[PDB]
Design a protein around this ligand. Sequence first.
Ligand SMILES: *[C@@H]1O[C@H](CO)[C@@H](O[C@@H]2O[C@H](CO)[C@@H](O)[C@H](O)[C@H]2NC(C)=O)[C@H](O)[C@H]1NC(C)=O
Ligand SMILES: *[C@@H]1O[C@H](CO)[C@@H](O[C@@H]2O[C@H](CO)[C@@H](O)[C@H](O)[C@H]2NC(C)=O)[C@H](O)[C@H]1NC(C)=O
Ligand SMILES: *[C@@H]1O[C@H](CO)[C@@H](O[C@@H]2O[C@H](CO)[C@@H](O)[C@H](O)[C@H]2NC(C)=O)[C@H](O)[C@H]1NC(C)=O
Ligand SMILES: *[C@@H]1O[C@H](CO)[C@@H](O[C@@H]2O[C@H](CO)[C@@H](O)[C@H](O)[C@H]2NC(C)=O)[C@H](O)[C@H]1NC(C)=O
Ligand SMILES: *[C@@H]1O[C@H](CO)[C@@H](O[C@@H]2O[C@H](CO)[C@@H](O)[C@H](O)[C@H]2NC(C)=O)[C@H](O)[C@H]1NC(C)=O
Ligand SMILES: *[C@@H]1O[C@H](CO)[C@@H](O[C@@H]2O[C@H](CO)[C@@H](O)[C@H](O)[C@H]2NC(C)=O)[C@H](O)[C@H]1NC(C)=O
Ligand SMILES: *[C@@H]1O[C@H](CO)[C@@H](O[C@@H]2O[C@H](CO)[C@@H](O)[C@H](O)[C@H]2NC(C)=O)[C@H](O)[C@H]1NC(C)=O
Ligand SMILES: *[C@@H]1O[C@H](CO)[C@@H](O)[C@H](O)[C@H]1NC(C)=O
Ligand SMILES: *[C@@H]1O[C@H](CO)[C@@H](O)[C@H](O)[C@H]1NC(C)=O
Ligand SMILES: *[C@@H]1O[C@H](CO)[C@@H](O)[C@H](O)[C@H]1NC(C)=O
Lengths: 421, 162, 196
Amino acid sequence: AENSVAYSNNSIAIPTNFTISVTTEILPVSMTKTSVDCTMYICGDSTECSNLLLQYGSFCTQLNRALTGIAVEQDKNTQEVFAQVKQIYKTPPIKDFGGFNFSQILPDPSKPSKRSFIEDLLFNKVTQKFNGLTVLPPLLTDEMIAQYTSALLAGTITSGWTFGAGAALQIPFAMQMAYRFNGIGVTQNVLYENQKLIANQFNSAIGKIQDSLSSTASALGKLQDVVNQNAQALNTLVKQLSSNFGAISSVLNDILSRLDPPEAEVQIDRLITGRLQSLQTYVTQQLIRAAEIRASANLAATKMSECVLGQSKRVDFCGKGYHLMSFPQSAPHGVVFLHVTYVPAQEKNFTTAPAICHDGKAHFPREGVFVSNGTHWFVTQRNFYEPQIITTDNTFVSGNCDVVIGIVNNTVYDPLQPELD
Amino acid sequence: ESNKKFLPFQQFGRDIADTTDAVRDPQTLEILDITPCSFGGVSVITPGTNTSNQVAVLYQDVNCTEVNVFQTRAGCLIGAEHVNNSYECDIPIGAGICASYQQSIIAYTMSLGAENSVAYSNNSIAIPTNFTISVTTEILPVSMTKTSVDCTMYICGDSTEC
Amino acid sequence: GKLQDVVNQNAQALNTLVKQLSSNFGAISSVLNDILSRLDPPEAEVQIDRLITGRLQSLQTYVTQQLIRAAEIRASANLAATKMSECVLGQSKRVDFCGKGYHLMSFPQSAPHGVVFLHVTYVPAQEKNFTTAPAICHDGKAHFPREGVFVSNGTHWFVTQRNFYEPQIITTDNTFVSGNCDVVIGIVNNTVYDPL
Ligand SMILES: *[C@@H]1O[C@H](CO)[C@@H](O[C@@H]2O[C@H](CO)[C@@H](O)[C@H](O)[C@H]2NC(C)=O)[C@H](O)[C@H]1NC(C)=O
Ligand SMILES: *[C@@H]1O[C@H](CO)[C@@H](O[C@@H]2O[C@H](CO)[C@@H](O)[C@H](O)[C@H]2NC(C)=O)[C@H](O)[C@H]1NC(C)=O
Ligand SMILES: *[C@@H]1O[C@H](CO)[C@@H](O[C@@H]2O[C@H](CO)[C@@H](O)[C@H](O)[C@H]2NC(C)=O)[C@H](O)[C@H]1NC(C)=O
Ligand SMILES: *[C@@H]1O[C@H](CO)[C@@H](O[C@@H]2O[C@H](CO)[C@@H](O)[C@H](O)[C@H]2NC(C)=O)[C@H](O)[C@H]1NC(C)=O
Ligand SMILES: *[C@@H]1O[C@H](CO)[C@@H](O[C@@H]2O[C@H](CO)[C@@H](O)[C@H](O)[C@H]2NC(C)=O)[C@H](O)[C@H]1NC(C)=O
Ligand SMILES: *[C@@H]1O[C@H](CO)[C@@H](O[C@@H]2O[C@H](CO)[C@@H](O)[C@H](O)[C@H]2NC(C)=O)[C@H](O)[C@H]1NC(C)=O
Ligand SMILES: *[C@@H]1O[C@H](CO)[C@@H](O[C@@H]2O[C@H](CO)[C@@H](O)[C@H](O)[C@H]2NC(C)=O)[C@H](O)[C@H]1NC(C)=O
Ligand SMILES: *[C@@H]1O[C@H](CO)[C@@H](O)[C@H](O)[C@H]1NC(C)=O
Ligand SMILES: *[C@@H]1O[C@H](CO)[C@@H](O)[C@H](O)[C@H]1NC(C)=O
Ligand SMILES: *[C@@H]1O[C@H](CO)[C@@H](O)[C@H](O)[C@H]1NC(C)=O
């Protein structure tokens, strides 16, 4: 949408209201751990064919090592993302966080595989030995992974930064948000005066999460395209057995039945040359595809150390807006974050001035912006409109009133003067 | 015996990739199913020849009724005893179970970590009294080996006719 | 291990490459010297070409994994350059980027085909428990701390920094006033010392 907001050299727009927004973000961490056996696949339990494969050197020694290097790596990728806490913290038995509910994300003491109320939905929107192909099971089961997210999340609501910097310390949540507010340059007096309103916004934003995850038909597209690619690359591998590759018959068994060894060996080599070359294609595809997952498994590793275990000043990564934290959530083959950010709203305009003339000396603001509501001038913080009387407690003196342009005339009240009288 | 219902004309059954899934009896006309004998990867768990010569063989995804035998989600361990303790596991088997050399090879349910609980009251804070400086190393690979191969040297081998 | 594996993987992928020259690929002999003096040249190309298409295919493979493995190093070399630019030539506020704890500085050390850092961090220890309060009333006005936390040991309220004990008597310069204290939930009364 086209927009054009008016700009003036002595005009500033300071927001007067905030709006807490919770935005999800889905990343893939690991994929299926496949493994292929050549003799069962290429040969097919044929002793005559097994001797022919020896002529091709050691092509399948590496083809089992290549599919194993990207098999232990997947179990490694899950380690950095989740296993970043030495000790498994536990939720306190009494939930009194000053109005914040957290029941939508905390573990649920109910039917087994004790996941959260949101993790249950995420496990429903994403949801074998035939010849050589197998599927190895992951080292970290979904039950154990859910405990890792039930230790980071269950502790970050009580300590904050302290997990990444030694033994955990106790801070009430009603006071922890004051730390978060002060990070974005907003004084803590805003929080305590608006605890009830913020808690309602915090709970309402989380409530819309599972009501929007279920509303959209496909919200897990990032985590589903990974599964589709793996299934598509595995289905095509099996169909390669139904191709002759230049031989009389696609199936290797009947060739030995009706052909002499002097002639069968000539045409079996067509199958072995084709099938072996048809297997190295997927191995190279997997190696490139695995490198595209580790590039995202490392992005989520940092986004769990920086967004979760602390407040990140990086703009527009830990959610869009002024970032505070991010409650991590499990996923079948990935991680789902819940970034809690601030989006200012309800804007108002004022006329500004870089300095103030009082007794021939400039008065720049110590912390805040000079604004006026039309007649009188005030000092307000950057991200929230709170006017205060201009005194020496929030201004400093430097230079002379002849070097910087745009100064207005006003009197800075000295708080010490009325005390003497 | 074939679970599926067939017809008296089709003899051979195929599912995917020219696999003879079902085959019809030519005399009794009782159509059956053909499946090969169960397969399984033989994974050898060893603590190294330097320590000792002992092996806990694991067969991939087969119950312990068709092969101290222990049954796991990834298969069955034969040669290792399962103990109800839980340590930071040594040899990663899979499905939340590992092995270690300690009456030699023992299978665990690996522990995530030392469980801790902290009380958090709305009017309680904890501020440290002291600091502890520490130096933690970190190792990263920067460069590789600058290899180079003469392609003609390989395939031909100083042979003009080749 | 992160530096030993890269040396071993390249040395092993190269070692398993040379061993591929002793494979028949269907020819009578795996060595090209004897196949020349034993076969007549109209009959020679059909058997040599088997080695041509077999050795070339092997060479085409290991070149590909070198390209893939080089991406695993370049991606790990841009990260190393980031560590040198940020943690060594400055102080980084990123959490757990350069060590468990709060970062101070790093010392880079050389290594064969790699680099080793020495991250110096803080791990606060020996914590002691207290009762706290978000604000303090005084003459019908709230009092929020400029920098620190209101901390009491049972009798008197102090103001201490978030990572150490600097308990000073609460004064008008350690706190800032923000309206009447009727909306703050859980405020505890105390007398704010006037230093004037
Ligand atoms: C505050 O911001 C601007 C300052 O005037 C006002 O926006 C006007 O409407 C559009 C953009 O929203 C511009 O084309 C105009 O130039 C703006 N200025 C006008 C009409 O004078 C906006 O209305 C102001 N809002 C308040 C409450 O003061
Ligand atoms: C703007 O700030 C005010 C209060 O700081 C908010 O107004 C409240 O809105 C809710 C419902 O929307 C009401 O239940 C309250 O009674 C209102 N309070 C007052 C004093 O009127 C408002 O939510 C904020 N606007 C935005 C977009 O965040
Ligand atoms: C957190 O969630 C809701 C907020 O609406 C609170 O009330 C529950 O709402 C659900 C309906 O979705 C009911 O099925 C429950 O019976 C309600 N009670 C409980 C204990 O779940 C809920 O109380 C809040 N949790 C708290 C305050 O601990
Ligand atoms: C906005 O500027 C006006 C002055 O034009 C101020 O509002 C008046 O301030 C006097 C105090 O000197 C009061 O007695 C009046 O009741 C106010 N009138 C109105 C309509 O508000 C005021 O200083 C400024 N508004 C602030 C600081 O909120
Ligand atoms: C702001 O204040 C200064 C001084 O208080 C004003 O400077 C005066 O400007 C007029 C016209 O040039 C001179 O005749 C006076 O001599 C100046 N005052 C003094 C004490 O020398 C200045 O004009 C004021 N500017 C605005 C925008 O109000
Ligand atoms: C809490 O800390 C204060 C500061 O030390 C203690 O107050 C002092 O206690 C000593 C004796 O232990 C007295 O000599 C001082 O006169 C006290 N100073 C003030 C300003 O009161 C206080 O005793 C401590 N409370 C507890 C329970 O240990
Ligand atoms: C903290 O705030 C004030 C301290 O004066 C106390 O409330 C006032 O005093 C009496 C009771 O002490 C109340 O009936 C009045 O409503 C209050 N008056 C004013 C002007 O605020 C309050 O009791 C103190 N709280 C505690 C736990 O001691
Ligand atoms: C803004 O522009 C007007 C027009 O030139 C000028 O009078 C005024 O001094 C300027 N103020 C600042 C701060 O530049
Ligand atoms: C005292 O400190 C311990 C931990 O060091 C904590 O378990 C306990 O809750 C604290 N008691 C009070 C009243 O703060
Ligand atoms: C803290 O929680 C308890 C609930 O047992 C409550 O009685 C008390 O008033 C709360 N303290 C504050 C300052 O809200």
